[PDB]
């Protein structure tokens, strides 16, 4: 820092005093920064001041006197930016930084100001709900921010290890979610948090800090690096194996996080990330639950056929996929369907000819549950039926006991209430797996009529009137049914009636899409709207609805966990995606997806990455969706109209797509000229370089699903290009007749970028789209 | 290309004594010579920007190229080689098809009737 005053003379050669302007702009701290630099040079001159001091400059001493008056000042807040001036001119001090620190830490931590009641019982979260805004988060120095981080860490260590009743304020958890995105602090950020803060929280054994951290990792993070993603995946596997996680919320939150990060995976990182944990493939897999392993297998399936890595081979041997699946098949036997095998890659289909468990017999499945159904009433004592029906190792058959009670009496006694809570949510996935098998097997042979509508409503009785589980788990267990032919269609129609015949969950979805928006960081009162939504619908997560219907009066009053961002709809949207995938895997359940999309299109208001998901959905079923035209047109009728408001105008669609695509079919699709495709290529090539107005709107790319506008443009262009009713045969003809034949609106001395975009498009395109290039090259070589 | 830019108002013999001498300096086949003669005429037609310069360049490529070729036939065999020159010339599909977007029609018919008019 020696020659910097000469850097003054080239930058600021002046003679007249600098007046003090208005402080209210966040950029004024940039203008007041060099005064703070001089006073921090005096902070450097705090020690060894006998060597070569600098006199105060004539022009800057007016603002130096101003900051000295601010030091004499005893009031600082958001009225001006003197909070930033006193946090930045005195950041390298020992006690001059504590004066703004005392104002800051008592206004967002919630230091016992107010105890807001969260939904549930006995949840006194702290008072403050207004976090540090975006302009405040950038008006501070890095050292002031990291000193604030150290102070916050010293507060939360003694808060977590004491397990105090003082919870963390919504303002401070919002600020905590906001600060971790900045990679300048990442050395002491989440890398310094999973090294320091997370081991101390693990040693604390608090179970509430972990739940809130999981809440702000699932519903508040947007860009986690894949190595950090699998590090957190290992951390949650180490956490869930210990600390008696038999609670419903502890299992449910970690399931909604694991399935989220499974669905947040793409298609290109599957190969380099696996060899990092190739030494330990077992611990990154589910040992007890079929659901997570099947989700990972389908993640592998969508990461290979889309990237077309399987072609040129027809076996799994000699690749990186054989050993991970060898670790998959252990301790989790899972069947596979032929229609599900249809969209699988060739080597994957060849490997699925072995190591595949068959289905269990329906007749014995009903015979055993009926044989112990009469043993339920052979003697009706409490303790013997509680113990005999609920040890770990019993065949999971209890939902049919409950169902045979509520087919004709609608009453669950003390035994039924005690068994379900004694089993715990860790075995509830394995229970509901076989219960979904009961459901599909029972409706396969069911007779239509009054029972068809009665059964779905008494099933909704467990959904919202008994509150046994969150709705997502049962529907996902019904989604992974690997049956052949009629039973798969029957289960799809089970889900079809489950989503529309009861209106309670649809009322909650409507309430959340009307009263909440995905822009959570810009929503300062997100906590207030969450409290209103949870007060409208009382979320019962510990069999509370099941408790009041018990014939003896039995109630649960356990204290709930601190919940700020969790709800059923966000936990169900990945299940809503996997059921859509299962529907599109099978043919004769096509039009049933058509009536659902226009019915339940609002939940995609709150999708973490809807564009990539719809692109993969339309790409993976390329051999399943080209034949069904109106089914392919139906998708743009529902999901695009959902996120057309919060995402700005022109975020996804083109003008002629708004004119002719979502219009209903008339047996005459608009076969376009090549200039329509040239418009899309011109959209792509300008967004690759980027423009200040931009054809596509700018957004907070830190909190998006794309870190760059180029990735945002590529995905939407890939969505719109291959969503037409025409198959992947004429698409290549049009793409080449743009370039192989002459074209208007396409200029030279730029065509390299155009053909680069076309090449990336056609490599992102499915197999028949670019297999026609071989037939093209045959003609020109001959 | 330099002649039709600004100094296209001269006589027909300066360009002749330039280009025929160019064939003296570098070994150039006469079919390749006529191939260049016609592809320069096409390029100066299409690559000329729209405006009065388009009209000037098209007139330069249409009205002075018969004058030089009549004198070349007078001073020189010149019937057989231009057939192989057109054998070369009738393969340039995309660049000359890009000219037909601007010209909205088939210029080949007009030019191959113009050559017949020149005999």
Strand content of chain A: under 5%
Main beta-sheet strand count, sense and barrel state of chain B: none
Specify the overall morphology of chain B.
Answer: globular
Largest interface, C-beta within 8 A = A-B, 4 and 5 residues
What does the main sheet of chain A amount to?
Answer: 2 strands, antiparallel
Number of alpha- plus pi-helical segments of chain A: 41
Look at the helices and sheets of chain A and give the structural class. mainly alpha
Assembly context of the chains: part of a larger assembly
Number of strands of chain B: 0
N-end to C-end Cα span of chain B: 26 Å
Which structural class best describes the helix and strand composition of chain B?
mainly alpha
Question: Could you estimate the helical fraction of the residues of chain A in percent?
Answer: 55-70%
PDB class: transcription
Keywords: Transcription, Mediator, CDK8, MED12, MED13, CKM.
Entry title: Structure of human transcriptional Mediator complex
Chain A: Mediator of RNA polymerase II transcription subunit 23
Description:
The structure is cut from a larger assembly and holds chains A (782 residues) and B (119 residues). In chain A, 56% of the residues lie in helices and 1% in strands. Chain A contains 41 helices and two strands. In chain A, strands 1-2 form a two-stranded antiparallel ribbon. In chain A, helix 13 (248-263) packs parallel to helix 15 (290-302), helix 23 packs across helix 25 (471-479) and helix 25 (471-479) runs parallel beside helix 30 (568-585). The N and C termini of chain A lie far apart (71 Å). Chain B has 119 residues and is an all-alpha fold. Chain B has seven helices and no strands. The interface between A and B is small, with 4 and 5 residues. Chain A: Belongs to the Mediator complex subunit 23 family.
